[PDB]
Design a protein around this ligand. Sequence first.
Ligand code: CA
Length: 279
Amino acid sequence: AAQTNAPWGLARISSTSPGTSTYYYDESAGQGSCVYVIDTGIEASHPEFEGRAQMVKTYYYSSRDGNGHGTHCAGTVGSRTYGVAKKTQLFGVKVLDDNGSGQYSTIIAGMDFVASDKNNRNCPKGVVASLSLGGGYSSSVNSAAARLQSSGVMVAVAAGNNNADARNYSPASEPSVCTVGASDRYDRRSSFSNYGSVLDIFGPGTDILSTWIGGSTRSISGTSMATPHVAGLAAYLMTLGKTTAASACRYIADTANKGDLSNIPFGTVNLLAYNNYQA
Ligand SMILES: [Ca+2]
């Protein structure tokens, strides 16, 4: 399958070089997998989700995404136009309020919820979780992300937008999950993107067009935008039977575009998420 005039991030995921405009992907498109988007919620009614999205848990007064961030990330995971895995099932877990902030105990609770809630969903190809959030280092937040990964969920987390080493940020610094940095359309590390040895992979994170609340769309930047690319890719690769949840992190790093990124500090991996599609 080929999506012409796709967002640059999708085209980047399916190409060894930057500057392309077509997203090439296998028609399976992550069908049979599921991705928990743990953020501000998902506007499941957005036509781009085609009814494949739904809220499963909120830790606030409404399950409604009043911010737009969670809808944007869910769109990059699996919306029709802006999604990596265009047939994956999206589950929204609203651990962040409509101002985009959420207490650590709430984020931990949402991760524990996903670890249990997946046991009553039909996700034969596997389960992914996209955590486009984070703050300062927390051993308990890291432990919660590790538990979610240990429970059999491919956990992708944002490295953070501090232009610092991700070692001081959670859940970015938890080793067992896949920590995602951000790159721009010219194969540079995004100016804001965190780095460090804890990073596993880079994804398109600068000027990412995706869904927004109110049935609209908008382009925003952040490692929070790179994370759903990697999670959508994991759901895409798991549906293809190429990897499992416990190994998708290394498989994606195994098959990434190597050395293509600039301004990667020494000690940070130079790997760009890549689906290695050929047809
Ligand atoms: Ca890791």
